[PDB]
């Protein structure tokens, strides 16, 4: 497959190789704050990242992933809408060419500069590849980035980006603490959806935090200096690696807060 984010291989094209692109529970979506309903039955969200073991950062030609050791219950997400225990496997971002776009989810059609996805898989399915074949296989914690003050806990990420400029480059990335990427509040919206890149599988419980984090214009500028291309290929800046909002169809977005 040769999918991407350009005119010729971008989201409008994806359905030909990945027909579930036009399915019933695709992501992202617009979150209409006046239609999402507070759900008193939602349990409290539990982000348990104290024992997280980061390993490596990889430019995969679509984003950069910070990868974790998920061979045991070291960094897990539980509670909220979730039954059981979801292990952190990786995080990555989606961002724009300009500060007015980049997020995949929108809020009342508002686009943020970027969006962080912390990807977890349901440990009842044993491995990640099995989990993505299940409707409750993944939980993705989504966090909006707005441009403002620098996020100190992001700076170790931006400083390593010079070493993974092009597709297929990786760097050691141990001892990174993903707690430094969270906002203060864990108030969230939740709905059932999908991966937002091919293969677009309908396996995700989305948990999108209401409170965005602020990053500096310098920090996001360094994201936009990455490359989609491999080394020694013509330079294509890694920008606008976001899928736009998809039809809500027969789904309700629930709020954890009033
Ligand atoms: O950008 C994303 O949100 C998609 C990430 C992703 C992409 C492919 C597969 Cl199999 C699994 C995952 Cl979690
Ligand atoms: Na983990
Ligand atoms: Na609205
Ligand atoms: Zn993502």
Swiss-Prot record:
Changing residue 60 to T: Reduced activity. The active site is at 62 (proton donor/acceptor). GO terms for cellular component: apical part of cell; cytoplasm; cytosol; extracellular exosome; myelin sheath; plasma membrane. Changing residue 197 to S: Enhanced p-nitrophenyl acetate esterase activity, but normal CO(2) hydrase activity. The record marks 90 as: Involved in the binding of some activators, including histamine and L-histidine. Activated by X-ray, histamine, L-adrenaline, L- and D-phenylalanine, L- and D-histidine, L-His-OMe and beta-Ala-His (carnosine). Changing residue 104 to D: Normal CO(2) hydrase activity. Target of drugs used in treatments against glaucoma disorder and breast cancer. This is Carbonic anhydrase 2. It comes from Homo sapiens (Human).
